[PDB]
Amino acid sequence: YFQGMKITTKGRYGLTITLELAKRIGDGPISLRSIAQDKNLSEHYLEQLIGPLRNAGIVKSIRGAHGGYVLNGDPEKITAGDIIRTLEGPIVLVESMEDEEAAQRELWTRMRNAVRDVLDQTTLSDLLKHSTDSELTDGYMFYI
């Protein structure tokens, strides 16, 4: 039972996969078994996430004994939104109550625009550099 908006293991492990493929560009196909072993994840579960990524053109498969997956594009052009919205269902930032009026909805509109823009403008390259101070002195919570 986790806190904050619903971004599940599908999006998160999707990110793990595409980031590892982004790190290893130029090393040939990378197997899901190797990513699974490296990150202590279920290979069988990753095999279920790789399909939507492949079908959306984010990764490509190479069959055979030396096969696996490669990133299918520039990490400087592929976004966090590309990956997350491929693997997650619709993610609700906030729900408006029935009695709410326009003034309150404007706040939700702005918050939604803001987060959506982060997804749409942050690239795999941005993430691999990870140069913004998280400000988490400890723990795992991102408080607004």
C-beta nearest to Cl ion: residue: 8
Q: Which option in a second copy, Cl ion, none does residue 125 bind, with CB closer than 5 to 8 A by kind? A: none
Stretch that binds Cl ion, among 4-12, 44-52, 56-64, 72-80 (CB under 5 A): 4-12
Closest to Cl ion by CB, 8 vs 125, is 8
Nearer to a second copy, 65 or 144 (CB): 144
Tell me the three-class secondary structure of 8-36, residue by residue.
Answer: CHHHHHHHHHHHHHHHCCCCCCECHHHHH
**Nearest CB to Cl ion, comparing residues 12 and 24:** 12
Give buried/exposed letters for 25-50 (b at 16+ CB in 10 A, else e). eeeebbebeebbeeeebeeeebeebb
